[PDB]
Design a protein around this ligand. Structure first.
Ligand SMILES: Nc1nc2c(ncn2[C@@H]2O[C@H](COP(=O)(O)OP(=O)(O)OP(=O)(O)O)[C@@H](O)[C@H]2O)c(=O)[nH]1
Ligand SMILES: Nc1nc2c(ncn2[C@@H]2O[C@H](COP(=O)(O)OP(=O)(O)OP(=O)(O)O)[C@@H](O)[C@H]2O)c(=O)[nH]1
Ligand SMILES: Nc1nc2c(ncn2[C@@H]2O[C@H](COP(=O)(O)OP(=O)(O)O)[C@@H](O)[C@H]2O)c(=O)[nH]1
Ligand SMILES: [Mg+2]
Ligand SMILES: [Mg+2]
Lengths: 38, 343, 55, 430, 442, 442
């Protein structure tokens, strides 16, 4: 249980590829391409 | 050396930014033992100018309520930043105010001479004021001096009040403040006059003369004014302003391509300067011709050889420093007056 | 988390156990959450920000 | 939005005296009752805790109940005691005897009707009534029995309001009374049904706060009750002062309680630091946030590192940025992610209030819903089962009139509360 | 001519304070509702009329309502500096909040207050002669903003019908968060908002914090900065009604140009010359530089990256000293860029507006003074990413019925959760389907 | 920017008192921790930041910990004049001394205290933004300085990694001696210092006594004089971080320029104008005279003669009124001399630094006021003679196991003596091998 140093207390930039809550979205797109072809 | 514990003087300062139209506040430090200056920002504690040497500064220049030229800009010193500079710079910065009446304008040159180079008062505020009767009564001018132009001077020297009383006794006609409240009211008078000065505008028969700072450092301004008055001119207008490099360029643009030392002439007008406007009560006198005849050739060596009694032969040292700048055409009078006196 | 279990016979002045804290506590006095006193409360953010603008 | 306070028994009356001192100080009320404050911000919410009596005076909306008047004479003799309305002191003629059954059944039913008349008189005078606030110990006699009796009656009469309790519970090491397990078990059984929100404090945690953090040489019960009065007065601050993000007791409950039985919370208050050290460290949002999650500053003996946070709430007082709060709560959630229950996407609520407590630039109070609270109840249940198998002191309770079936019911209900917390501790997404 | 502003709850009232501060300072109305004695002379003018009405004694009063369930924020406006500007009837306050419960606002508490709101809006609409829409400011994260905003928009939509309703909405940021129950309230709000709004503009505080860190030099921003930026955006969009220009844009043109299908009405917003006073004098700020600025996602006021989707329509509003030839050259350069892509069914992607009034400078403000600005609102498929994370968070929480007993106890059927979640699933599929390439049909 | 000071045992704490006295007097911080009232102008400068941090009320507090196993010296600091300067948490004290046993400090007693110390150092390092090394002061002759210094350096080296560790170390003098068991503690200490330090500075009390007798006119010197000289040396080395100058030198530059091979990191130190006020007014003090002085064996603070070896690198720090051309002329004159020899693989033997701040004068001090000073640290093979004499005394004592039963009783295997003695033998052989000419090896 550590809060860490002061210099690392800032806002991390948002990266939606590594957002854990959007993985089903990317999986859905990867399925959608083949669904459109068929 | 370049030590950090060396003695210094500290002030709060102001400087107007003509680009952003904003006023900036700094903290100025002057190490008088070796003539170096550092400037820091008050708002965010940011460095503005690293410690650098300036050879044209002196200890006597730094006084409260004064103005300096630094890299072409004007900086105003109105504060004390610590107790040490209050102890060191005190006892030589007491403020007194002197007023002059109508009957003594024809001898104003000798008045300024006795004020500066013999009574020891060094002063940078000097304006001419015309007031209505009710405002003059409210501000507290002497009753006998009402209905006339008055010249107020803000002097500074050791033991200002007693020396001002002595100056009153020495030469008649002048009046001086006898208390602190009188000083404050007369400072209000000079500021209000600065908001809207008095002069004649749109008169083709007029002339404006500027006195260079190096002439003032030699305590020769009063003699120059008296010599100008003696030739047959009547003083109408007086001021003490600090002009920046942009103002000097705007005032001297037509000369671009005439003077062989133009950037050096531009630098010679930085600092405290006096402004004089002269008119004649006789229609048979051309003010520009007599002013230029008195001033003399703009080259001091030629002036010394040919016109030994001229102003520039009397007080000039080089082409860039010729101690006077005066109008040279018959149409420049209104333009110079509009530049130097229109709010 | 444990509790102190030592009996201190001596007074503050003898360098044993909690002399520093004892000296400070006897210097100041009673215990309050407040640190400074006689200071006005600050105004709200809306009152401080939305004032009368300059004309 | 008016709160009515009830203080019961010795602990409750003692904590109440310091609470009403702290509240009267922040609003500048003299012990004579006269307002002497220096800003309008103080006056505009005075109604929240005080009623106005004629020509200046303010009176505090509190009911005092006890079975022997000794404590009441002590509070009446105290420095602020005069402020309290004389008609609000209710007392009997014989003590609780440290027995739950006496306090609940014999002297309880005798006095309780006069307390209900006073509570109704106080409630119906408000233009809009907010929840009740009750302070009592669970280990005592009249506090547990008569407090829970009154709580049950008020829940019958006002079921749509909020019920909030501050409660002192026996230390596992520092017992003050032999029969503590019975009184505690019966009171927890009553509370888990009746209460909406319950806060628990261990005296051992206040001693450890004083010795380790404040380094006090000779602490007294006045210091412990000052810490408690400070935290109690902090939770309501957003009710009664302006701020950038207002908050309310009902909004706290909605964000803190996932399921209706899970309403037992941990408490903390952050700016604690010794008089010698205070010159060495300025207040800032990182320092308060670091102290706020440190278990040293948390007021129960169970430690958070052995459990998981379901939810938490932080109320900030002072002129400060919202960005620093949001990024601090994000950073604590990201770096310690194993200690936060994973099926809730954000566990911390923040709130910001403009007006700090007097003499502090900023402060925060922390309320935490953590599964490590199950360890206290398990300890009480073990000691109860040890005592109950042998009928160790049971004849007192049976002689007052209790049926043995109440003890088995209360034990079963506490065991189910411990089981429910344990199940949510070890839950998984699957 | 006229527009009426509706402010709901805490975010909407606080943003309203900054908006009305700005509109006063730009027109020149004093905080007491009058004008200086020398501002009456000149040419006969009325441009304020879109936002103010005069009684005839020369006081101005604004075409707005402020709605809240808790008193504190409205009592702060009532006791503040602008006390004399607002009509006391305009400041409506209830007794107690909706406690982050959408159900409490919609079913239990808002039903009592809603008829006063409708009577006030009726009293406003009777004193108009060219009403051209409703502007609504609210946050969907809290209980009263969601529940009463939905209920009031439903009633307004029945009574007034076809009149347009444009919303500025503060959505829950993707990793900064303030309350636990945000997903439920945002889903349930969005279900009602789908049927009863014409364009919805989305804002996230995390984006405005990023913008204030990168462009301005502010280490510790607070809500007044964000609200002043929002006020500037609203002033830019409504300037087209109020001042002369080369290419005017009526409020109906946004709705006509931006929305291709009636459900596809959620738009992204960005603003260009966010710059500090010290930086502004070292650089020129030409048309092409700020036009290039509006397309980087670091400039946006919503946390989405448009490079992961395709634009369908853009509306670019220029105010200040701009010449049409520079706008055409800029748009042609943008069109040349390879990282900007339009759906193939929208070949003619742009609408332009050009207004002569430069942006106003506010005495306490942090923006520099600048001669020109551009503001963009645009419709793009990237927005589908915003809904997917809220829907995932709802699914995570709802799998265990984490808080549902509050909603069911305060008056809501359990069925309403499943209906709203299915409607948002269909909205996700709509954004999936619309984004499918029409090419390769043979 | 920042540096953290760790003081261990008696010599290290007493030298710390002189160091912090000097750093306070150079910056102008008063013993209470605040700037003088007649010198607070409103704004100031960052130079203190290397050694002090401000809380915000303007008190200064220093970046140091004082570590001891006996209370007496730290209790003297707690009750002394500087009580208010130090944070009380920084002053850490145990119960009982390590009784001149390295084994007792390392195994028995220091193992309990070390984790509190590491927590304090961690708390310091978190309140920094450009930490660039550790400075450590200790003596290797005593038990706690050797044992706890080694244990703490090992833990620091694991936890912080790449961060630099610079040691100032007082070694046992060649004929002045204070305790019988000094050789054993110094050998076992030196074994740990070899692996876990980047540069090690060597001091001998007999040299500083000789220097204070010969140059200063002091017949009866005491430890306060030596500690003031050490403080001057540390101030000279750290001045490059703190004040403006022509040629700055960052702490990472010392290791790159001074250390040719990773084991060859033990350096000699000297200081030029140690002079009294009465001599100072009879003589000019130009750059070339003090440059010639630092190479004379009469100037060194360690008892070794460099004429018995070859220089590998020199780092020369000039502070005060010096001009680079004079430094170049002086260094060019030194290279000509025949009694100064460099290894043939090091052609560019010198590093220079030039700083404008002249050395400070301490009110009770014995040094004169001078306009310039130079301080030198240099790497030379002559140091091998210092280790050989300690090893000879160790061999004499260990042949009869003169005191070993204490060390074995406090927890140590007899084998550890032979390992350490073999490591010092290998260090001696390294200094023999590195100094061999390539021309003879072809
Ligand atoms: N940008 C911005 N966001 C705000 C502001 N005020 C609140 N918010 C945000 O909006 C959300 C909170 O919504 P509230 O307006 O407080 O909710 P409410 O309308 O009061 O609903 P109740 O709590 O039931 O009364 C949080 O995400 C806040 O960060 C504001 O002034 N500006
Ligand atoms: N120059 C200098 N040398 C000192 C000082 N104090 C002690 N010494 C020398 O260092 C050696 C003694 O080391 P100490 O510091 O006393 O050992 P210690 O760290 O106290 O270890 P313990 O005795 O176990 O507590 C002897 O050679 C002393 O002459 C000092 O203040 N200045
Ligand atoms: N923190 C605190 N605890 C108290 C105080 N007074 C009593 N107690 C504790 O409460 C318990 C005794 O309960 P008590 O109030 O006498 O019960 P009652 O007889 O029913 O009123 C014991 O554990 C006491 O230590 C107080 O002022 N503060
Ligand atoms: Mg609200
Ligand atoms: Mg010792």
């Amino acid at each position: 249980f550590t809060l860490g140093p002061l210099q690392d207390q800032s806002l991390p930039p948002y990266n939606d590829l590594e957002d854990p809550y959007l993985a089903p979205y990317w999986a859905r797109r990867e399925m959608l391409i083949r669904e459109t072809a068929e | 050396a370049r030590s950090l514990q060396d003695p210094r003087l500290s002030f709060y300062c102001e400087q107007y930014d003509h680009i952003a139209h904003r006023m900036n506040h700094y903290v100025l430090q002057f190490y008088f033992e070796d003539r170096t200056v550092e400037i820091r920002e008050v708002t965010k504690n940011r460095l503005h100018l690293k410690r650098a040497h300036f050879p044209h500064l002196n200890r006597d220049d730094f006084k409260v309520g004064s103005s300096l030229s630094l890299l072409g800009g004007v900086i105003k010193l109105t504060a004390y930043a610590d107790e040490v500079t209050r102890e060191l710079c005190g006892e030589r910065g007491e403020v007194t105010a002197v007023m002059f009446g109508e009957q003594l304008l024809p001898q104003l040159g000798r008045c300024l001479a006795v004020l500066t180079e013999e009574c020891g008062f060094v002063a940078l505020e000097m304006q001419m004021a015309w007031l209505p009767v009710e405002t003059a009564a409210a501000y507290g001018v002497p009753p006998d001096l009402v209905e006339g132009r008055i010249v107020v001077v803000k002097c500074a020297n050791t033991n200002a009040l007693q020396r001002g009383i002595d100056f009153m006794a020495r030469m008649p006609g002048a009046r001086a403040a006898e208390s602190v409240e009188e000083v404050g009211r007369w400072e209000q008078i000079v500021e209000k006059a600065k908001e809207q000065p008095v002069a004649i505008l749109g008169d083709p028969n007029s002339t404006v003369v500027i006195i260079k700072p190096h002439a003032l450092q030699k305590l020769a301004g009063g003699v120059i004014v008296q010599q100008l008055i003696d030739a047959g001119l009547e003083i109408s207008g007086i001021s003490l302003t600090n002009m920046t490099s942009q103002q000097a360029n705007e005032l001297l643009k037509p000369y671009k391509g005439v003077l062989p030392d133009f950037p050096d002439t531009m630098r010679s007008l930085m600092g405290t300067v006096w402004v004089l406007q002269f008119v004649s009560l006789d229609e048979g006198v051309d003010v520009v011709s007599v002013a230029r005849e008195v001033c003399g050739p703009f080259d001091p060596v030629i002036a010394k050889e040919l016109r030994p009694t001229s102003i520039r032969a009397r007080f000039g040292v080089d082409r860039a420093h010729n101690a006077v700048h005066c109008c040279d055409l018959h149409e420049e009078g209104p333009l110079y007056s509009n530049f130097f006196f229109r709010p | 988390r444990v509790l102190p279990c030592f009996d201190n016979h001596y007074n503050s002045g003898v360098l044993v156990d909690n002399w520093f804290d004892a000296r400070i506590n006897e210097a100041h006095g009673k215990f309050t959450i407040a640190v400074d006193g006689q200071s006005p409360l600050p105004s709200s953010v809306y009152k401080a920000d939305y004032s009368t603008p300059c004309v | 939005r008016e709160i009515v306070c009830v203080q019961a028994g010795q602990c409750g009356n003692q904590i109440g005296s310091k609470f009403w001192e702290v509240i009267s100080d922040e609003h500048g009320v003299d012990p004579t009752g006269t307002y002497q404050g220096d800003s309008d911000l103080q006056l505009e919410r005075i109604n929240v805790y005080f009623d106005e009596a004629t020509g200046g005076r303010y009176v505090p909306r509190s009911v005092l109940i006890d079975l022997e008047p000794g404590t009441m004479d002590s509070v009446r003799a105290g420095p602020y005691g005069q402020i309290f309305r004389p008609d609000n002191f209710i007392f009997g003629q014989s003590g609780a005897g440290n027995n739950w059954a006496k306090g609940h059944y014999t002297e309880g039913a005798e006095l309780i009707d006069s307390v209900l008349d006073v509570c109704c008189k106080e409630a119906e005078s408000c233009d809009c009534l907010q929840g009740f606030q009750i302070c009592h110990s669970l280990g005592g006699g009249t506090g547990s029995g008569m407090g829970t009796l009154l709580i049950s009656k008020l829940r019958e009469q006002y079921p749509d309001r909020i019920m909030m309790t501050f409660s002192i519970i026996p230390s596992p090491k520092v017992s003050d009374t032999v029969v503590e397990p019975y009184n505690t078990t019966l009171s927890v059984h009553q509370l888990v049904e009746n209460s909406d929100e319950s806060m628990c404090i261990d005296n051992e945690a206040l001693y450890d706060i004083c010795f380790r953090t404040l380094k006090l040489t000779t602490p007294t019960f006045g210091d412990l009750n000052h810490l408690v009065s400070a935290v109690v007065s902090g939770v309501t601050c957003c009710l009664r002062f302006p701020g950038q993000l207002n908050s309310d007791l009902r909004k706290l409950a909605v964000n803190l309680v996932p399921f209706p039985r899970l309403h037992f919370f941990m408490m903390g208050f952050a700016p604690l630091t010794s008089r010698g050290s205070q010159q060495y460290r300025g207040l800032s949002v990182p320092e308060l946030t670091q102290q706020m999650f440190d278990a040293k500053n948390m007021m129960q003996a169970a430690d958070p590192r052995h459990g998981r946070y379901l939810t938490a709430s932080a109320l900030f007082r002072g002129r400060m940025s919202t960005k620093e709060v949001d990024e601090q709560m994000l950073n604590v959630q990201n770096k310690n992610s194993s200690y936060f229950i994973e099926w809730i996407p954000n566990n911390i609520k923040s709130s910001v209030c403009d007006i700090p407590p007097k003499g502090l630039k900023m402060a925060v109070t922390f309320i935490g819903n953590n599964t490590c609270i199950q360890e206290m109840f398990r300890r009480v249940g073990e000691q109860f089962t040890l005592m109950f198998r042998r009928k160790a002191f049971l004849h007192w309770y049976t002689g007052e009139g209790m049926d043995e079936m109440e003890f088995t019911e209360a034990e079963s209900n506490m065991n189910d509360l411990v089981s429910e917390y344990q199940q949510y501790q070890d839950a998984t997404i699957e | 001519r006229e527009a009426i502003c509706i402010h709901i709850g805490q975010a909407g009232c606080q943003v309203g304070n900054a908006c009305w501060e700005l509109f006063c300072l730009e027109h020149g109305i004093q905080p007491d509702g009058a004008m200086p004695s020398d501002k009456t002379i000149g040419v006969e003018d009325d441009a304020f009329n879109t936002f103010f009405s005069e009684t005839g004694a020369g006081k101005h009063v604004p075409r707005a309502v402020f709605l809240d369930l808790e008193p504190t924020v409205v009592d702060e406006v009532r006791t503040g500096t602008y006390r004399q500007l607002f009509h006391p009837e305009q400041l409506i306050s209830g007794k107690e909040d909706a406690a982050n419960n959408y159900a409490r606002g919609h079913y239990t508490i808002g039903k009592e207050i809603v008829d006063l709101c409708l009577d006030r809006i009726r009293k406003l609409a009777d004193n108009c002669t060219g009403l051209q829409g409703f502007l609504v400011y609210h946050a969907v994260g809290g209980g009263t903003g969601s529940g009463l905003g939905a209920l009031l928009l439903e009633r307004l939509s029945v009574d007034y019908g076809k009149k347009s309703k444009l919303g500025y909405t503060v959505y829950p940021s993707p990793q900064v968060s303030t309350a636990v129950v945000e997903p439920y309230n945002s889903v349930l709000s969005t279900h009602s908002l789908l049927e009863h709004t014409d364009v919805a503009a989305m804002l996230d505080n995390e984006a405005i914090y990023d913008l204030t860190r990168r462009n301005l030099d502010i280490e510790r921003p607070t809500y007044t900065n964000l609200n002043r930026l929002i006020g500037q955006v609203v002033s830019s969009l409504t300037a087209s009604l109020r001042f002369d220009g080369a290419l005017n844009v009526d409020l109906t043109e946004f709705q006509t140009n931006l929305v291709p299908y009636p459900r596809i009405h959620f738009v992204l917003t960005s603003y260009a010359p966010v710059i500090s006073a010290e930086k502004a004098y070292h650089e020129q700020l030409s048309v092409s530089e700020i036009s290039n600025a509006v397309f980087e996602p670091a400039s946006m006021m919503t946390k989405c990256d448009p490079r992961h989707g395709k634009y369908m329509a853009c509306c670019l509003m220029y105010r200040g000293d701009v010449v049409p030839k520079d706008v055409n050259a800029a748009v042609a350069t943008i069109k040349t860029k390879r990282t900007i892509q339009f759906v193939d069914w929208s070949p003619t992607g742009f609408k332009c507006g050009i207004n002569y009034q430069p942006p106003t400078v506010v005495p306490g403000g942090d923006l520099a003074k600048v001669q020109r600005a551009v503001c963009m609102i645009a419709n793009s498929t990237a927005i589908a990413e915003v809904f997917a994370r809220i829907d995932h968070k709802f699914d995570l929480m709802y799998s265990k019925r984490a808080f549902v007993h509050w909603y069911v106890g305060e008056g809501m059927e359990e069925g309403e959760f499943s209906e709203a979640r299915e409607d948002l699933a269909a909205l996700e599929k709509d954004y999936e389907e619309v984004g499918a390439e029409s090419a390769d049909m043979d």
